[PDB]
Every structure is written in structure tokens, then in C-alpha cells.
């Protein structure tokens, strides 16, 4: 079933594409991008980004070293998640919090949120996919396919198993659109 989601990400050759652009709007007013977009406050203001969710807050090479102060006086609201892009990091512990932050942005009619990591490839797509599942009632295959059509994404297999877990839970509670 993780394999099923991998087949939806790739052409089948066992290899996977990387993002072709630093930022993409993957669903209306939800953007996924990389460190360079997130650190370019003028760029952010021109797209109308009001909210930034840094899914890779940290100081290593797999992390983006920003914080609430970085965006102070920019008018942009910030949430940092110190997530690691590995098989074992439990990003699911943050699904609720990230979805609530995405919701808070979209509840504003002029709100647009950027969910990013260093590459925009593994951590942030997982959070957006989870958001679509728990708040737009999409199953995981639908949510993942919609995001993958608009950006080359590639959650690691740990993140995919966690999304599968979320899917069965949402299916069991009968909370997925027919």
C-alpha cells in the first residue's frame, strides 16, 4: 500500500523526479516550495503569502534555519516544525497542528499559505496531503495524486506509511468523501 502510493509518484522505473520549480500552488491558495522561496520575503509578499509553515525548522543541511523573528515586520505569520526527513520521524504527530494552521490561513479570504521544507519534496507535501485528507475529506490516493500533478513530490516511505495509517483511521470513522 505504501508501494501503491510510490507507483502514483513515479513513472514505474524505480526512480523519482525532483521539483522542476522552487514553488508550486498545489491546491487553491496552498503553495509548496523550497528554502529559497521561504527565505525570499519580497517574493513571498508578491505572491500574497500571508502564512508560512516551515516543516523543516533546524540548523543542519536538511533544515531551513528560520523562525518567527525572521518574518517579523514582514506581516507574515509563521509556524515552525523541527521535522527530520527520515523513515522514523513521526510527522503524523504534527498533522493536526499543521492542518489547523493551514485552516487558519485559508479561513481568511485573502490568505495564502506556503508549506515548505528545504527541497519542498518530502515533509511539506506530506503535511498538505494530510490536510486534504482530514479537512477536505479526500482519501490518500486522491489527495496525493492532486498534489503530485502540481509538484514533483516524494514523501519518504515512513511518511507514506503514516498517511496510510491516517487513511484507515479516517475511513474507519467514515470521514472520507464517498
PDB file of C-alpha atoms in Angstrom:
ATOM      1  CA  UNK A   1       0.000   0.000   0.000  1.00  0.00           C
ATOM      2  CA  UNK A   2       2.988   2.258   0.529  1.00  0.00           C
ATOM      3  CA  UNK A   3       4.024   0.709  -2.783  1.00  0.00           C
ATOM      4  CA  UNK A   4       0.698   1.825  -4.288  1.00  0.00           C
ATOM      5  CA  UNK A   5       1.491   5.408  -3.301  1.00  0.00           C
ATOM      6  CA  UNK A   6       5.025   5.116  -4.701  1.00  0.00           C
ATOM      7  CA  UNK A   7       3.578   3.969  -8.035  1.00  0.00           C
ATOM      8  CA  UNK A   8       1.448   7.143  -8.090  1.00  0.00           C
ATOM      9  CA  UNK A   9       4.599   9.277  -7.583  1.00  0.00           C
ATOM     10  CA  UNK A  10       6.804   7.813 -10.313  1.00  0.00           C
ATOM     11  CA  UNK A  11       6.745   6.517 -13.863  1.00  0.00           C
ATOM     12  CA  UNK A  12       7.467   2.960 -12.641  1.00  0.00           C
ATOM     13  CA  UNK A  13      11.232   2.910 -13.353  1.00  0.00           C
ATOM     14  CA  UNK A  14      12.037   2.881  -9.615  1.00  0.00           C
ATOM     15  CA  UNK A  15      13.330   6.467  -9.885  1.00  0.00           C
ATOM     16  CA  UNK A  16      11.502   9.682  -8.976  1.00  0.00           C
ATOM     17  CA  UNK A  17      11.608  13.238 -10.283  1.00  0.00           C
ATOM     18  CA  UNK A  18      12.681  16.264  -8.215  1.00  0.00           C
ATOM     19  CA  UNK A  19      10.770  19.596  -8.226  1.00  0.00           C
ATOM     20  CA  UNK A  20      11.137  21.447 -11.536  1.00  0.00           C
ATOM     21  CA  UNK A  21      10.393  24.860  -9.910  1.00  0.00           C
ATOM     22  CA  UNK A  22      11.147  26.284  -6.456  1.00  0.00           C
ATOM     23  CA  UNK A  23       7.433  26.750  -5.624  1.00  0.00           C
ATOM     24  CA  UNK A  24       4.031  25.476  -6.816  1.00  0.00           C
ATOM     25  CA  UNK A  25       0.429  26.162  -5.899  1.00  0.00           C
ATOM     26  CA  UNK A  26      -0.762  22.620  -5.406  1.00  0.00           C
ATOM     27  CA  UNK A  27      -4.379  23.405  -4.490  1.00  0.00           C
ATOM     28  CA  UNK A  28      -6.092  26.848  -4.482  1.00  0.00           C
ATOM     29  CA  UNK A  29      -4.080  29.144  -2.129  1.00  0.00           C
ATOM     30  CA  UNK A  30      -1.848  26.338  -0.798  1.00  0.00           C
ATOM     31  CA  UNK A  31       1.757  26.539  -2.028  1.00  0.00           C
ATOM     32  CA  UNK A  32       4.611  24.056  -1.553  1.00  0.00           C
ATOM     33  CA  UNK A  33       8.171  25.166  -2.128  1.00  0.00           C
ATOM     34  CA  UNK A  34      11.837  25.084  -1.117  1.00  0.00           C
ATOM     35  CA  UNK A  35      14.176  27.003   1.192  1.00  0.00           C
ATOM     36  CA  UNK A  36      14.939  29.711  -1.362  1.00  0.00           C
ATOM     37  CA  UNK A  37      11.271  30.710  -1.737  1.00  0.00           C
ATOM     38  CA  UNK A  38      10.716  30.687   2.025  1.00  0.00           C
ATOM     39  CA  UNK A  39      13.772  32.911   2.645  1.00  0.00           C
ATOM     40  CA  UNK A  40      12.838  35.471  -0.056  1.00  0.00           C
ATOM     41  CA  UNK A  41      10.434  37.748   1.839  1.00  0.00           C
ATOM     42  CA  UNK A  42       9.925  40.089  -1.184  1.00  0.00           C
ATOM     43  CA  UNK A  43       8.986  37.093  -3.351  1.00  0.00           C
ATOM     44  CA  UNK A  44       6.605  35.975  -0.600  1.00  0.00           C
ATOM     45  CA  UNK A  45       4.937  39.380  -0.466  1.00  0.00           C
ATOM     46  CA  UNK A  46       4.428  39.431  -4.237  1.00  0.00           C
ATOM     47  CA  UNK A  47       2.595  36.090  -4.327  1.00  0.00           C
ATOM     48  CA  UNK A  48       0.475  37.334  -1.444  1.00  0.00           C
ATOM     49  CA  UNK A  49       1.769  34.738   1.011  1.00  0.00           C
ATOM     50  CA  UNK A  50       0.305  35.576   4.430  1.00  0.00           C
ATOM     51  CA  UNK A  51       1.313  32.375   6.255  1.00  0.00           C
ATOM     52  CA  UNK A  52       4.484  30.281   6.202  1.00  0.00           C
ATOM     53  CA  UNK A  53       4.738  26.787   7.645  1.00  0.00           C
ATOM     54  CA  UNK A  54       8.387  25.739   7.877  1.00  0.00           C
ATOM     55  CA  UNK A  55       8.181  21.939   8.015  1.00  0.00           C
ATOM     56  CA  UNK A  56      11.979  21.680   8.314  1.00  0.00           C
ATOM     57  CA  UNK A  57      12.978  24.133  11.051  1.00  0.00           C
ATOM     58  CA  UNK A  58      16.569  23.498  12.095  1.00  0.00           C
ATOM     59  CA  UNK A  59      20.239  24.232  11.596  1.00  0.00           C
ATOM     60  CA  UNK A  60      21.527  21.281   9.531  1.00  0.00           C
ATOM     61  CA  UNK A  61      21.784  20.815   5.740  1.00  0.00           C
ATOM     62  CA  UNK A  62      18.380  19.041   5.708  1.00  0.00           C
ATOM     63  CA  UNK A  63      16.847  22.029   7.541  1.00  0.00           C
ATOM     64  CA  UNK A  64      15.920  25.683   6.961  1.00  0.00           C
ATOM     65  CA  UNK A  65      17.204  27.985   9.709  1.00  0.00           C
ATOM     66  CA  UNK A  66      14.357  30.479  10.150  1.00  0.00           C
ATOM     67  CA  UNK A  67      11.987  31.429  12.959  1.00  0.00           C
ATOM     68  CA  UNK A  68       9.174  33.787  13.916  1.00  0.00           C
ATOM     69  CA  UNK A  69      11.575  36.730  14.162  1.00  0.00           C
ATOM     70  CA  UNK A  70      12.827  36.196  10.582  1.00  0.00           C
ATOM     71  CA  UNK A  71       9.323  37.217   9.427  1.00  0.00           C
ATOM     72  CA  UNK A  72       8.670  39.960  11.985  1.00  0.00           C
ATOM     73  CA  UNK A  73       7.626  43.319  10.483  1.00  0.00           C
ATOM     74  CA  UNK A  74       7.034  41.388   7.271  1.00  0.00           C
ATOM     75  CA  UNK A  75       3.408  40.856   8.329  1.00  0.00           C
ATOM     76  CA  UNK A  76       3.707  37.134   7.565  1.00  0.00           C
ATOM     77  CA  UNK A  77       2.506  34.674  10.213  1.00  0.00           C
ATOM     78  CA  UNK A  78       4.950  31.847  10.971  1.00  0.00           C
ATOM     79  CA  UNK A  79       4.788  28.292  12.303  1.00  0.00           C
ATOM     80  CA  UNK A  80       7.929  26.162  12.621  1.00  0.00           C
ATOM     81  CA  UNK A  81       8.077  22.378  12.795  1.00  0.00           C
ATOM     82  CA  UNK A  82      11.515  20.881  13.518  1.00  0.00           C
ATOM     83  CA  UNK A  83      10.881  17.841  11.382  1.00  0.00           C
ATOM     84  CA  UNK A  84      13.564  15.491  10.061  1.00  0.00           C
ATOM     85  CA  UNK A  85      13.207  13.888   6.621  1.00  0.00           C
ATOM     86  CA  UNK A  86      13.838  10.279   7.718  1.00  0.00           C
ATOM     87  CA  UNK A  87      11.886   6.997   7.762  1.00  0.00           C
ATOM     88  CA  UNK A  88      11.446   7.126  11.530  1.00  0.00           C
ATOM     89  CA  UNK A  89      10.481  10.742  12.293  1.00  0.00           C
ATOM     90  CA  UNK A  90       6.840  10.792  13.383  1.00  0.00           C
ATOM     91  CA  UNK A  91       5.479  13.656  11.323  1.00  0.00           C
ATOM     92  CA  UNK A  92       1.928  12.374  11.972  1.00  0.00           C
ATOM     93  CA  UNK A  93       2.229  13.887  15.462  1.00  0.00           C
ATOM     94  CA  UNK A  94       2.065  17.270  13.686  1.00  0.00           C
ATOM     95  CA  UNK A  95      -0.772  16.582  11.188  1.00  0.00           C
ATOM     96  CA  UNK A  96      -3.456  18.150  13.407  1.00  0.00           C
ATOM     97  CA  UNK A  97      -1.362  21.218  14.197  1.00  0.00           C
ATOM     98  CA  UNK A  98      -0.321  21.775  10.581  1.00  0.00           C
ATOM     99  CA  UNK A  99      -3.887  21.328   9.298  1.00  0.00           C
ATOM    100  CA  UNK A 100      -5.141  23.819  11.900  1.00  0.00           C
ATOM    101  CA  UNK A 101      -2.536  26.313  10.663  1.00  0.00           C
ATOM    102  CA  UNK A 102      -3.485  25.760   7.039  1.00  0.00           C
ATOM    103  CA  UNK A 103      -7.149  26.153   8.040  1.00  0.00           C
ATOM    104  CA  UNK A 104      -6.375  29.369   9.893  1.00  0.00           C
ATOM    105  CA  UNK A 105      -4.797  30.808   6.745  1.00  0.00           C
ATOM    106  CA  UNK A 106      -7.496  29.713   4.317  1.00  0.00           C
ATOM    107  CA  UNK A 107     -10.261  30.908   6.652  1.00  0.00           C
ATOM    108  CA  UNK A 108      -9.045  34.379   5.682  1.00  0.00           C
ATOM    109  CA  UNK A 109     -10.344  35.213   2.211  1.00  0.00           C
ATOM    110  CA  UNK A 110      -7.069  36.885   1.212  1.00  0.00           C
ATOM    111  CA  UNK A 111      -4.951  34.243   2.984  1.00  0.00           C
ATOM    112  CA  UNK A 112      -2.347  32.148   1.162  1.00  0.00           C
ATOM    113  CA  UNK A 113      -0.059  29.677   2.958  1.00  0.00           C
ATOM    114  CA  UNK A 114       3.347  28.359   1.936  1.00  0.00           C
ATOM    115  CA  UNK A 115       4.290  24.959   3.382  1.00  0.00           C
ATOM    116  CA  UNK A 116       7.952  24.345   2.678  1.00  0.00           C
ATOM    117  CA  UNK A 117      10.967  22.366   3.686  1.00  0.00           C
ATOM    118  CA  UNK A 118      14.490  22.543   2.253  1.00  0.00           C
ATOM    119  CA  UNK A 119      13.548  20.973  -1.107  1.00  0.00           C
ATOM    120  CA  UNK A 120       9.762  21.087  -0.927  1.00  0.00           C
ATOM    121  CA  UNK A 121       9.740  17.428  -1.672  1.00  0.00           C
ATOM    122  CA  UNK A 122       9.114  15.178   1.366  1.00  0.00           C
ATOM    123  CA  UNK A 123       7.996  16.848   4.608  1.00  0.00           C
ATOM    124  CA  UNK A 124       5.763  19.664   3.401  1.00  0.00           C
ATOM    125  CA  UNK A 125       3.836  17.583   0.772  1.00  0.00           C
ATOM    126  CA  UNK A 126       3.047  15.085   3.496  1.00  0.00           C
ATOM    127  CA  UNK A 127       1.506  17.799   5.663  1.00  0.00           C
ATOM    128  CA  UNK A 128      -0.559  19.161   2.749  1.00  0.00           C
ATOM    129  CA  UNK A 129      -1.736  15.662   1.799  1.00  0.00           C
ATOM    130  CA  UNK A 130      -2.738  15.015   5.410  1.00  0.00           C
ATOM    131  CA  UNK A 131      -4.540  18.384   5.473  1.00  0.00           C
ATOM    132  CA  UNK A 132      -6.532  17.466   2.349  1.00  0.00           C
ATOM    133  CA  UNK A 133      -7.483  14.160   3.961  1.00  0.00           C
ATOM    134  CA  UNK A 134      -8.577  15.419   7.351  1.00  0.00           C
ATOM    135  CA  UNK A 135     -10.195  18.702   6.219  1.00  0.00           C
ATOM    136  CA  UNK A 136     -11.299  18.197   2.608  1.00  0.00           C
ATOM    137  CA  UNK A 137     -12.279  14.534   3.254  1.00  0.00           C
ATOM    138  CA  UNK A 138     -10.085  13.166   0.419  1.00  0.00           C
ATOM    139  CA  UNK A 139      -8.640   9.719   0.613  1.00  0.00           C
ATOM    140  CA  UNK A 140      -4.888   9.498   0.407  1.00  0.00           C
ATOM    141  CA  UNK A 141      -4.690   8.381  -3.223  1.00  0.00           C
ATOM    142  CA  UNK A 142      -6.833  11.332  -4.337  1.00  0.00           C
ATOM    143  CA  UNK A 143      -5.021  13.916  -2.202  1.00  0.00           C
ATOM    144  CA  UNK A 144      -1.562  12.630  -3.143  1.00  0.00           C
ATOM    145  CA  UNK A 145      -2.373  12.474  -6.870  1.00  0.00           C
ATOM    146  CA  UNK A 146      -3.701  16.043  -6.883  1.00  0.00           C
ATOM    147  CA  UNK A 147      -0.562  17.372  -5.180  1.00  0.00           C
ATOM    148  CA  UNK A 148       1.729  15.259  -7.373  1.00  0.00           C
ATOM    149  CA  UNK A 149       0.061  16.603 -10.530  1.00  0.00           C
ATOM    150  CA  UNK A 150       1.082  20.110  -9.452  1.00  0.00           C
ATOM    151  CA  UNK A 151       4.528  19.411  -7.972  1.00  0.00           C
ATOM    152  CA  UNK A 152       7.157  16.685  -8.200  1.00  0.00           C
ATOM    153  CA  UNK A 153       6.835  15.415  -4.639  1.00  0.00           C
ATOM    154  CA  UNK A 154       8.245  12.369  -2.922  1.00  0.00           C
ATOM    155  CA  UNK A 155       7.384  11.713   0.740  1.00  0.00           C
ATOM    156  CA  UNK A 156       9.687   9.094   2.241  1.00  0.00           C
ATOM    157  CA  UNK A 157       8.192   5.653   2.841  1.00  0.00           C
ATOM    158  CA  UNK A 158       7.858   6.365   6.553  1.00  0.00           C
ATOM    159  CA  UNK A 159       5.745   9.423   5.791  1.00  0.00           C
ATOM    160  CA  UNK A 160       3.716   7.391   3.292  1.00  0.00           C
ATOM    161  CA  UNK A 161       3.015   4.670   5.880  1.00  0.00           C
ATOM    162  CA  UNK A 162       1.858   7.346   8.314  1.00  0.00           C
ATOM    163  CA  UNK A 163      -0.510   8.732   5.645  1.00  0.00           C
ATOM    164  CA  UNK A 164      -1.854   5.215   5.060  1.00  0.00           C
ATOM    165  CA  UNK A 165      -2.393   4.942   8.830  1.00  0.00           C
ATOM    166  CA  UNK A 166      -4.272   8.262   8.740  1.00  0.00           C
ATOM    167  CA  UNK A 167      -6.309   6.975   5.789  1.00  0.00           C
ATOM    168  CA  UNK A 168      -7.536   3.789   7.506  1.00  0.00           C
ATOM    169  CA  UNK A 169      -8.368   5.810  10.610  1.00  0.00           C
ATOM    170  CA  UNK A 170     -10.330   8.359   8.563  1.00  0.00           C
ATOM    171  CA  UNK A 171     -12.011   5.539   6.615  1.00  0.00           C
ATOM    172  CA  UNK A 172     -12.905   3.696   9.859  1.00  0.00           C
ATOM    173  CA  UNK A 173     -14.520   6.808  11.300  1.00  0.00           C
ATOM    174  CA  UNK A 174     -16.285   7.123   7.929  1.00  0.00           C
ATOM    175  CA  UNK A 175     -14.787  10.580   7.378  1.00  0.00           C
ATOM    176  CA  UNK A 176     -13.698  10.191   3.730  1.00  0.00           C
ATOM    177  CA  UNK A 177     -15.813  11.505   0.843  1.00  0.00           C
ATOM    178  CA  UNK A 178     -17.570   8.556  -0.912  1.00  0.00           C
TER     179      UNK A 178
END
